[PDB]
Amino acid sequence: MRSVEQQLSIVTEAAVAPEPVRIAIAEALGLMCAEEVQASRALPGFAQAAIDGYAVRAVDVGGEKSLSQKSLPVVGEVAAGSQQPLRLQPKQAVMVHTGAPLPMLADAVLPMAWSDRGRKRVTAQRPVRSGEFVRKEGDDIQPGDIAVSAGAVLGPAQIGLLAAVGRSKVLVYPRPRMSVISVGAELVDIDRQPGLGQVYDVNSYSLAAAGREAGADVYRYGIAAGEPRRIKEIIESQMLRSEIIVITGAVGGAGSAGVRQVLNELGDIDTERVAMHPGSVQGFGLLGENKIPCFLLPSNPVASLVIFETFVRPVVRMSLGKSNAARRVVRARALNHVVSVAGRKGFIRSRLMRDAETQDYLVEALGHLLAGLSEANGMIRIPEDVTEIRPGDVVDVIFLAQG
Amino acid sequence: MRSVEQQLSIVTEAAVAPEPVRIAIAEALGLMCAEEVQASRALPGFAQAAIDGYAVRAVDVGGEKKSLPVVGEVAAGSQQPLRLQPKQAVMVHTGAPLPMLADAVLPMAWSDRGRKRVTAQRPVRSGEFVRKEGDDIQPGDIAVSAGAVLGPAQIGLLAAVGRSKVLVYPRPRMSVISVGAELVDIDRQPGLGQVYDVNSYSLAAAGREAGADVYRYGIAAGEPRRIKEIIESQMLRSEIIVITGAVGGAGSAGVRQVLNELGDIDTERVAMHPGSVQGFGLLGENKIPCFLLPSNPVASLVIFETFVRPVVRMSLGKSNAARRVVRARALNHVVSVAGRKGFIRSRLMRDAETQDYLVEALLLAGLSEANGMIRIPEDVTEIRPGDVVDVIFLA
Amino acid sequence: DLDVPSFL
Amino acid sequence: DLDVPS
Ligand code: NA
Ligand code: NA
């Protein structure tokens, strides 16, 4: 038997970081950028009128006056989205709408309110200087500007930013891929009708969901059945596409020796118990030439969720390379009696609450499948030597935040 | 002009609650259960060995206070009933059905096994190490309640009672549409006069973060009759529609014309900056909320965060996910229009020495280095460095 | 601080 | 209480 801490070190040290991938920018939401992204186009890609008015050469409308102290033909009209090139000649105007592309060789927009507003010939009534009322090409982003840095989490604004500079794909740190497998001759799928000797496969659904909640990219393989040669094939196929593997029913007695022997042919398998309750019976192994973490969990659904919460979820967070998401631990007054095993750390699924008057934290232990899987939002963490918890005791509660 | 409060009130009152749907339990993770699920069978359906050992009558090994022949072996998944006779043992594997007329499993670790006979090193009592029929769930028990959020444990319970589908409150469906003759998709190389469609991508992503079930329609192009077709197609499968390019620049009159034929469209401005130019309407017989946003992408993100996201939280019927608001010291000056609530995209940080929050107000930087928004009250017109301000934290 | 149910 | 830069 080893301690929870020793087991936690073993599994976390073996975590595999997923290979970076180039993906459609819509599919990068929430993922960490694995590259520096520089703009390739200028934004805006062309000089545009900042207002409604007349594209001009400033010098033709008072722009060259020494600051310390006749009409122009309107040779076109341009709305936003226009695609035909224009070229200003000297002493000409082009009437422009907000966003319209500036004619070539213009350098200013004369505001409509600073003109006589003439349709074919326009008169300036106030001067404008070169550059005024133009959104210059590249005013928002220039080619080579850093749009997104490696290490940044890609949210909606960054996805918008990637689209603005014409990037449709980006290199990201993908979610770690986890495959969830159930073995056991007694298992049937939940669309079946179980007979004598048969049990619904609960664990593949609950643990695939726990892996999704933890941030993994989960494939629920479901039941793996057959002679061990066929089961070896299944596990090998999941090793090809996984950073983490979870197998329930592989540990806990002689019935799983055939599967365990297959696992020892695929890698190094350790089945020493952890000094914890529930979940002392578990295993851990590294499969293949890349040593994929493979968690061997028991058929017990409550013990399996506790093992997943304690050891698998940390590896998912590390594999992910984003935040640690380490669970908050609060101190609470125990509402009811709990017993615990001397020498094992206890993990009791519980109800954490706030006292309506004191504002103190209260915890009600819930420990039978219904009570174990009923709605729990915390776990009392009982130290190895404590054997008894009385109402009023102050205990550690692992807060199991929703989602 | 309406205040932010009046517009927020109008759109929130219009939220559509999606109808409950029956879906695969795997796909229900995080959704709220819309039904009470009762067990109909006992779980486990048969008494089963909890450990490897020997099924026995407790009385035969001292349990009601000599070796017993080992006359059989039962593995997990055994389907044929077995019958134990007095003063005999049957080797059982964890999970196997217990032989009939046995009542206890003597652990392997507590037994001295010959090649035919077994000797108990200590007694076990009746029921010990037996998972009795119905010990886990009994018929009539509530596996899942209406209103419960379906997490991993509740999905396990749904599987334990043999449910392959469950009735849930789905996420609200949102369609994101861009209109504008100048728009090209991001896989193209835009020429003179053409703009990448930024809004459909960024706003589809904001809707997903908000908790919606999002279809990004993308660019809607054509004469208004064709735009009416596209929009109508989205109304059939949506609780929320978001259209950018329907308000603001010209050319979008035809779009506002068809929207008025599908519902009553309101384009009164909101007393806020950025994003005062916007619209809101209710489309069709089912009064689907339809938001008209501008082409400016920063303004669109601000309008979406201020008005669309609350409606997604409201349609969802789960939590509000209301943004935390911290007080921070302003690092630089910000001006704001008298009478308009300001929403300035900003960078919220922690002071290197004091634990205090600092905020730096920020198009390239606004869409990049920003994790918060300074919320400038209608009356406040100026922020000087050192001022302490409200910052909406964008989690 | 935390967001938990209330109890009397 | 809040994850922000420095
Ligand atoms: Na203990
Ligand atoms: Na203001």
Numbering used by the authors:
A (entry chain B): 1 to 69, 78 to 375, 383 to 418
B (entry chain A): 1 to 65, 78 to 374, 384 to 416
C (entry chain C): 434 to 441
D (entry chain D): 434 to 439
Manuscript text:
We crystallized Glp alone and in complex with the 10-residue peptide FtsZCTD. The apo-structure was solved at 2.1 Å resolution and the structure of the complex was solved at 2.7 Å resolution. The FtsZCTD is well defined in the electron density and interacts primarily with a protruding β-hairpin in Glp domain IV. Glp has evolved a specific grove at the homodimer interface that creates the FtsZ-binding pocket for a 2:2 stoichiometric complex. To validate the Glp–FtsZ interaction observed in the crystal, we produced a deletion mutant of the entire FtsZ-binding loop between Met361 and Leu370 (GlpΔloop). The purified mutant protein was correctly folded but was unable to interact with FtsZ in vitro. Complementation of the Cglu_Δglp strain with mNeon-GlpΔloop failed to restore the septal localization or the wild-type morphology, stressing the physiological relevance of the crystallographic Glp–FtsZ complex.
In this work we have identified Glp, a gephyrin-like repurposed molybdotransferase MoeA enzyme, and its membrane receptor, GlpR, as components of the corynebacterial divisome. Our studies show that Glp and GlpR form a tight complex that is part of the early divisome, where Glp and GlpR directly bind FtsZ and Wag31, respectively, placing the Glp–GlpR complex at the centre of the divisome–elongasome transition.
